[PDB]
Design a protein around this ligand. Sequence first.
Ligand SMILES: [Zn+2]
Ligand SMILES: [Zn+2]
Lengths: 94, 93, 99, 99, 82, 83, 108, 109, 76, 148, 87
Amino acid sequence: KRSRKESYSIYVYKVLKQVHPDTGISSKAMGIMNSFVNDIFERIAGEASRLAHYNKRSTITSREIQTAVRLLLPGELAKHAVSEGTKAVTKYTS
Amino acid sequence: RSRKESYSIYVYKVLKQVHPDTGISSKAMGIMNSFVNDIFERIAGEASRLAHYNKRSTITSREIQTAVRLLLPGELAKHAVSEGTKAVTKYTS
Amino acid sequence: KPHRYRPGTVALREIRRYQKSTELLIRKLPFQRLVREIAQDFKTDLRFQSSAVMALQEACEAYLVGLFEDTNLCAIHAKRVTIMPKDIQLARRIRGERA
Amino acid sequence: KPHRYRPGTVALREIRRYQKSTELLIRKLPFQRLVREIAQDFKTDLRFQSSAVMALQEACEAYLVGLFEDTNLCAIHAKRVTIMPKDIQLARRIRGERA
Amino acid sequence: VLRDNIQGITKPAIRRLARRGGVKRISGLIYEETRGVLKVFLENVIRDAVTYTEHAKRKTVTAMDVVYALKRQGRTLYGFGG
Amino acid sequence: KVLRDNIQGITKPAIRRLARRGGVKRISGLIYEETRGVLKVFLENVIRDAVTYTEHAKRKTVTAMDVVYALKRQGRTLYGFGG
Amino acid sequence: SAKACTRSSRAGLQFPVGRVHRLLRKGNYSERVGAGAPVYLAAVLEYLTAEILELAGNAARDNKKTRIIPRHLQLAIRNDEELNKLLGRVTIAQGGVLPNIQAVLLPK
Amino acid sequence: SAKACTRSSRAGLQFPVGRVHRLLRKGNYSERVGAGAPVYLAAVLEYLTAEILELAGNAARDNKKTRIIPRHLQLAIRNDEELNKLLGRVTIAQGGVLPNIQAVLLPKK
Amino acid sequence: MQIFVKTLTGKTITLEVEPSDTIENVKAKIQDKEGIPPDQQRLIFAGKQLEDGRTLSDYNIQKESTLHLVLRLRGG
Amino acid sequence: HMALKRINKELSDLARDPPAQISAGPVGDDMFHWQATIMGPNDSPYQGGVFFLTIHFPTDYPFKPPKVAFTTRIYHPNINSNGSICLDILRSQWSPALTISKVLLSIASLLDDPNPDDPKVPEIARIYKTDRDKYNRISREWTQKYAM
Amino acid sequence: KDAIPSLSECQCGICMEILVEPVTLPCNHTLCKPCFQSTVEKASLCCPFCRRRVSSWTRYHTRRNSLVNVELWTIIQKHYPRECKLR
DNA sequence: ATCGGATGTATATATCTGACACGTGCCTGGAGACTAGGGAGTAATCCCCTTGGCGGTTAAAACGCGGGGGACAGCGCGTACGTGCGTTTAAGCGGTGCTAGAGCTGTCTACGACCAATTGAGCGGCCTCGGCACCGGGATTCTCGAT
DNA sequence: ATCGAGAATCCCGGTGCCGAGGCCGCTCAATTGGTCGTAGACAGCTCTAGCACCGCTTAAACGCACGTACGCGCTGTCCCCCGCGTTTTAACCGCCAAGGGGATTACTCCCTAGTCTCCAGGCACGTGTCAGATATATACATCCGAT
Ligand SMILES: [Zn+2]
Ligand SMILES: [Zn+2]
């Protein structure tokens, strides 16, 4: 058998089931969603790495990702994304 | 204090090598520093991505050569490739 | 006596039909042959995956659709309904593709 | 009896003179005050280095020069020497700045 | 050897593309300019893809290479990988 | 220390001079109100990015480095001011 | 949160956290990666995916279909404002274009 | 080579090679850095700088000045066909613009 | 003998085993006196992980020894 | 604050209508701390088993879920030896609408039948799945050891 | 709607109090502004009763400043003024 | 078709000043020698799939023709902008006072890198049934020549 | 202003098909537990320059009057895409056959990260001086009403 190939299929399907319980999704939409997730991940991580290199630091804390999300996304989406990330961080640590 | 390195002496040496009887002001010197940094960052980023694409973990000479071929236009790319190949060949022996 | 539509009143119907559809608009074999010749210009004896040709066709279609939208807008700005090549050169010059 | 130039020659002379020069064309204090007003909205009690203000002024001047070049091209395309706000809007929309 | 395939893009095909774009009346000189600009775009993208294939020590192009070639130029493409 | 009605500081002769550099031979009378709005929007974007950059670094004074970085991010790369 | 349970469940997310952490470390973005960054990044990704999926599902229900196809994604992305600005450059395969006819071309 | 002189002079260059190697290693671009890459990068950078400097020097000599100011750099970059495409998005500070006027706006005969 | 085992909960338990007693008998005694499932225990003597192959005589446990218990369990 | 008033309405609600086999009361002076008892349902392997559990309320209620802990020891695949409870409603779908009565009745319902899909303890869950009689007898001896 | 509202239905489903600055969700559920303004950052960003995401509607209405309903606020304050004044 | 103001721009010469080119102390980063282990080059082998080909068949492309609508050239107008000049305004430049805050340094504590055992989340291969596509029929709705 | 006939489009029902969601088996990567060098958080000190103020210029800005050229609307003419019909062409689908090269595993060797030690190359600092900006005074290209 061929080697494993990682993908974000399961998680996208789970989120879709959480939003619209009775709605399915096709394979081409899965490819599009996987590409979109990879694109956003690379953009955010690259911006965070660049910004951490600007201030002469070696670690990428949550603050760098927060600022990268504040920069890349439009303001209205940035506010909600920052709120969601702050939730996730404050709920994970306790 | 602190030390702020730059590409000053090398650019001045190249300028003297090309035009033996000319000079360069400070503002143009900073412009040259910024341009060199920009080109270096572009080439390094492209080479790093090329190395990551093929499941490789090193940056050999051919990665830099392919990045140069991609970024620069035709004649510039050909001349830069020739110059780099000559430099590395003269360096290895 | 035979029924004939007014000049230009079926172009609107064609627009309304095509902007609703999502299929490809260029025949597969001619575009594939064009891609093959352009490729073999650079290097001899290449082999193309089908998905690669499909991606190339999709990119070309999207680019041409955008260019035609901007060209139509230029033509309407010039107080015209037709589109002429000078509109295409103006759109390319402003977009910076040619400059 | 008084000697005055035909309307238009002075404009050409100013264009020729200004395309040769390289200094800045917006007064320093008004631009600094405008930058401070814009900045104080996002965060209060900020302080600006002089080099930052100069960089902002340079970038703004270059961007406006490019926009005016494109606007003049749009105006000349429609058989009009004069430029109009519709030309600016068309240039910005085609460049994708407003979308 | 293959040649004169640029004529494969027929006039009705460009007409349909323009109709999707949103034009109502097309002059008779659009077709040659459209062929020229399409050829230029294909030349650029295919050259980038062929260079990407060359760097990988392979003698066949892959849709993945074309996707990255499009991404480098600033025209990202979804639905084919990446 | 409030600031009001200051966008008008970009006078009519200044915009005329900028257009003259651009290559404009005859300017209408409605340009001088559109140009101020365009400049305000562009400056708003650049200043927002620069203020975010100086907010991350825990500093109270912006720097030419932050402005250069914001301009490079927005696509308008700038030379001769550091970097 | 309690220990000895999966991190994705500890943080309440759906997207994986360990996978994001591994990608951050081995993707050559920095020498060191914090422990809290993957949680934040996965949360942002999940929020964006949920938003776009909800819009696509609403469009598909409006189109009287039960499965989301790329045309629904194109409609959801372009109809919204912030999402359109974020995804202005990307091209959706087989997505089509929005119906737009200039008022001048319409018959009078 | 003889493996006796400094690395920069060993390759017959003027740009440093040790600095390029350090920047490549510590600039978190990849886990490992090859031995020959920095020489290639330094050569490319030197050659590009050489072209820009010679074009600026020519533009300054045509102006009857012995110093290269940013205006000369702008003229050299904009006039050359390939360099303009390479540096299309760059904004040179105090560089000005190339002088041109559309043929329509010239005075009528 | 008498062996004291300190757990992560601070519970004091004393076991009476023999040097010749095998690990199976010790685990049976643990099951009888505690009821905790056997798969959840890998014990540590002087920083060495215990293996059921060797008996207690090989270790030669000294009198009044403190025993530490750690092992990964899914569910917390 | 608002949490205190909400607790007041909820205590009045539980006082006016007592759930079957369920009683809740504040053992400590602080209103956030609570104690409750669970009685083994008739249609369950547990018979005549009564257990005591403690409830801790966060600073903000019902925005954050309460924490429930089992002081007594129960042998169950979904309950650890320490007494922690792994429940979906407790963390995944906690909502301000849900109340303490509902979460306790849900705990009782899960106590009726283990869920192998999300096993808190893997070995106990799998040995439960393999054979009914083994789990039945181990649960019986454990509940006579602890519950009675 | 419901020009003759009962006092029992005016209770907020969360804090059990008379509605203050009501906000109506697309699921036609009404609750006081503090409850929603809290649950948007410290709850699952979904309707507590319906359990479905409302991110898009909230995102669109936040910029438009159309969260509040003037008609329901007015009818509540005129029908039950003494509960509003004590707040 | 130029003619002579009238203007602005180009050109020749003294001068003096502040930035540019260069000398110098030195210290931090670059160079030289040895080790080891993991990454990368090389060889052998599988089988996926991409190229090549023949036959049907038929939707799409090519050619021709009538003509209605649109692009383009010419004319007239009145109004908005270019040009010039007197007047009010605030940028511009020098000099000074100061302190908020950038920037460097010494400690050390808590966050993150590293490594082995382990098993459960997640991927590959199968399978079936329902949602979607195709076709036949009818109801509904723009459209245009003639009133 | 409209009627009505011809043509395109939208609904509804029936039938068939194939891929999407669920399931089972398995291999590998995330968890956990513990250990240890170090990253940066914090407190403290230094000294740079960004802010605010003052006063004296005179350069750019402002408002007004006048004239003109050009943006806009209107009208007329020709010609060229459009819509339709008829015919020729190759795209498309199905089918078969082959072997080239992508992809995988196993093996070996050598390139480079790491460590330590030693030393000179570039950096901050200071100094002399001449290139170019400034002022002043001629000489020539260019524009404008009118012969
Ligand atoms: Zn409430
Ligand atoms: Zn709801």
